[PDB]
Write a protein that binds this ligand. Structure first.
Ligand SMILES: C[C@@]1(O)OC[C@H](O)C1(O)O
Length: 315
């Protein structure tokens, strides 16, 4: 059977654990050997070492959520020149460095979701807002944050973005950053935290400092991590998408391409228990690059979690 590596930014974070579980399950469904493995720290070096290991083992495909737009390119290009299928999921690399990106949404959809969620709680024309996510280099979150900032400048001209700070996919660093944000900005109105670790850290610090009544806190994380904060009312809402299914889609697409050849832009793949996915042009993500057998496969939906529906999810 095909050997397929599914690599997160780092392990030990619910988002990535859940994605990997979907990938591993799909392997069993589709008849492929799927290995979920990755570094304990979100480093370029760590990801490159795992990439090199799977390539050296003669794996047929790898699907990675990248901590960097370009840092993985040499390793991934080495992979592709040896006939290894290279794909990304969650966070992309430069399009000439992979084939397909299994993508939860466009920067506009996701940036727009962040802003809309924040706007629901701010309900004030003049406001002070902080951005808080993993790192200034990571592909996905910076794309979304840039799109969100652009929307804020246009839709909410009275909002002042007072700071952008980073938690580095780390509970302790994120906790310190969140407490620092709150203490520096006593009149802060919102925190937009598009990162699985940053969001719960912001919620926690707000509870620690009794700041939750005044700061609207939104972002992207998993239900199992955010549950306590939603149930207590510390935050009202946050977003994500079906990351388990995202992992499944990645594996099915990989296995299809291995068995049947490259998909082209416009082409569709039927996936049992999922539906139909389609290859979009890189243009949908804002890239200026196209090539045969290269593109972006968008997830069907994003979800907003509140106390009303969080009980319906377990990941
Ligand atoms: C869930 C999330 O926002 O945080 C970590 C992942 O890479 C993500 O999708 O960016």
């Amino acid at each position: 059977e095909n050997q397929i590596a599914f690599i997160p930014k780092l392990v030990g974070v619910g988002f990535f654990t859940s994605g990997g579980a979907g990938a591993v399950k799909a392997g069993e469904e589709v008849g492929a050997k799927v290995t979920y493995d990755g570094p304990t720290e979100p480093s370029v070096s760590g990801q490159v070492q795992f990439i090199n290991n799977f390539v050296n083992q003669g794996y047929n495909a790898l699907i990675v959520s990248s901590v960097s737009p370009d840092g993985l390119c040499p390793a991934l290009k080495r992979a592709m020149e040896r006939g290894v299928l290279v794909m990304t999921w969650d966070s992309d690399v430069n399009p000439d460095c992979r084939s397909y990106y299994i993508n939860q949404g466009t920067p506009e959809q996701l940036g727009g979701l962040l802003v809309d969620m924040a706007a629901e709680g701010v309900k004030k024309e003049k406001a002070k807002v902080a951005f808080f996510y993993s790192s200034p280099t990571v592909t996905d979150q910076n794309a979304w944050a840039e799109a969100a900032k652009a929307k804020i400048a246009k839709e909410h001209p009275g909002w002042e973005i007072v700071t952008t700070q980073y938690g580095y996919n780390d509970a302790q660093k994120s906790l310190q950053t969140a407490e620092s944000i709150l203490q520096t900005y006593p009149d802060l109105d919102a925190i937009i935290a598009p990162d699985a670790n940053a969001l719960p850290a912001a919620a926690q610090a707000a509870e620690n400092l009794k700041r939750a009544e005044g700061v609207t806190i939104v972002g992207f994380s998993t239900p199992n991590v955010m549950r306590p904060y939603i149930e207590r009312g510390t935050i009202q809402r946050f977003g994500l998408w079906d990351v388990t299914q995202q992992g499944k889609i990645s594996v099915f697409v990989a296995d299809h391409v291995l068995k049947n050849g490259p998909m082209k832009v416009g082409e569709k793949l039927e996936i049992p228990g999922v539906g139909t996915v389609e290859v979009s042009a890189n243009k949908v993500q804002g890239y200026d690059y196209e090539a045969d057998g290269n593109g972006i496969i968008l997830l069907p939906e994003r979800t907003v979690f509140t106390k009303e529906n969080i009980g319906n999810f377990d990941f």
